[PDB]
Nucleic acid binder design. Sequence first.
DNA 1: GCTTGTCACGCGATGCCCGAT
DNA 2: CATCGGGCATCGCGTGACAAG
Lengths: 289, 329
Amino acid sequence: MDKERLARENHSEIERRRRNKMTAYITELSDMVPTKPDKLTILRMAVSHMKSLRPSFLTDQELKHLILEAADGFLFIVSCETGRVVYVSDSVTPVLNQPQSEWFGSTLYDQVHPDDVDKLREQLSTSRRSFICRMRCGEPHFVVVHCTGYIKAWPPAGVSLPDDDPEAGQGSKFCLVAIGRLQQPTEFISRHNIEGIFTFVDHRCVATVGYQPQELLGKNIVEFCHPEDQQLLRDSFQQVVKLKGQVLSVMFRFRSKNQEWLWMRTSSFTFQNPYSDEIEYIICTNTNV
Amino acid sequence: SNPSKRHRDRLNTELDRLASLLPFPQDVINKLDKLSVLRLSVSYLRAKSFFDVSLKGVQDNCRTKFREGLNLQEGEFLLQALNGFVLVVTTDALVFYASSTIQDYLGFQQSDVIHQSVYELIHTEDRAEFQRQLHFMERCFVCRLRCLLDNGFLAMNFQGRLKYLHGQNKKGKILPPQLALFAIATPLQPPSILEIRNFIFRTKHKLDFTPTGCDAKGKIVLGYTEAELCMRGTGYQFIHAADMLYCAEYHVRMIKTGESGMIVFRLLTKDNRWTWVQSNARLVYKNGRPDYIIATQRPLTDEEGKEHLRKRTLKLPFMFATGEAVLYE
DNA sequence: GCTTGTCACGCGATGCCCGAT
DNA sequence: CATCGGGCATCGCGTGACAAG
Ligand SMILES: CC(C)c1c(O)cc(/C=C/c2ccccc2)cc1O
């Protein structure tokens, strides 16, 4: 219709529903404070209640509460210089079943799996960090932990460092402030050293064995193989080296991530260095049966 | 002098008193409108009422004053370690809360998002999935939210739970609490290295392609230093499995003619990432017989690496395989 | 030079309060 | 014990000033 009137009536409706939102908010405030009154009474009671309740919208522990309710985890602040545990929150008890007694006075290297101790180093050398390791907990018990965090300049602003504090003589230059949290018939290809260690894992593994590629790399394939099928799979891996370029097929059952046994046919052959004719790796095509 | 003018003056002075009490910096308070003032005070009241039910540091056997100072900001430390932001949303798709870091990731200031419908931030193609997530109770999903930094969207992983939002005092002509999503939203993560910088780099290898030298830019791109670069096997230990046969063919071509020809493949970096390269392998001779290889690579992007892969000349097994790798000494 | 939105304002229709019936 | 008219306060409506984008 007419230009000016279309604009005018839509402005009418905009102001009308502005007043509607206002009234709705005021009745929300009426629902939200201790104690039918008109809108001015509601506003005065609300400002009195807000003055009784009282810069950030939430207090520090409310923010922490929201975070930990959402996705668990525990905060740890270590130093990159030695991995020394500068700080660890209380939530490490519900996460690792460990007291704060165990992490203070220690380093992060003492709290993770030994074979991870070097991966840790690569994450602490010299913004964001995101890795996974195995942390401790009547014999030793490790659990997978996904850590994510950042590198911060030490000491933090606003936190006083007294003279007699144990941190006074530390003098770290950088810190990892992170949070750590717990936790189909196809085929996939893989590469192995002549000892049998996964060194390349096809992404189709999740569709065939359910594991993520990271869950397979670095481990020997026999580790996932039924204790009986192990000597046969080993003989296959050793004879595939003697017969370079030849195909060796072998059937064996593979423990899925759901800890089921899946029968698989693995066909292996060597990779020949085109100059030296030396074995670079073993190519396997692991197929479900 | 005017009746209704003085009535609305009373309304406005109470609105001013309400705005003065909001837990925001005064530079944020001054640029607030009255509607947002009421909305934010409602949000603050609902938050404090829920915390009065749900909530309440260093165990007193480890107590140092620096540790106590750190504990008093433990919350902000966790917030900075999120690499993302907290989102609490109600069954009515109302943003019960969003952390300040949302401004760092989407450009929306926290002041403008609370007590507003979360769908205003979410792609129309993903609001259905989000609402399906809003209604056995842990949650893990993906969603694309509005990105004002791009000015433009951002795909984010949401990890969270549904917990009863107490203290909301809902009614009907008194209601029980309903499930609100408490979640952390983080960006998505890619797996391949692309150089932003032309960054041509040469490396020397033995006749079996075992690396022996590498220039500066090569270090900048692949992440290894010289020693660790040579002590990891030959060159085939770094090559993506979907490319090893093509590089082997071009290696035999170089063995038989001296020149590789322009080949395209992927190489494993120190952080176990794949980087695309267009490379060329030439043989230097000593006394008329091959001595070593000088392979020069140009860093490529995935958009052109995949284009080279789809216009592949030869086709060989594992050509389209995708996967991760490792490398030891 | 247009769009969207905030704020104030004029204006009556009821609302509350309360001497006076 | 109400009922009833005063005058001011609430309250919702539409429009104009003005400004950020
Ligand atoms: C040292 C390592 C990362 C490396 C390199 O710096 C170049 C090549 C390139 C090899 C090649 C093969 C065929 C044709 C042309 C080049 C392979 C590597 O592992």
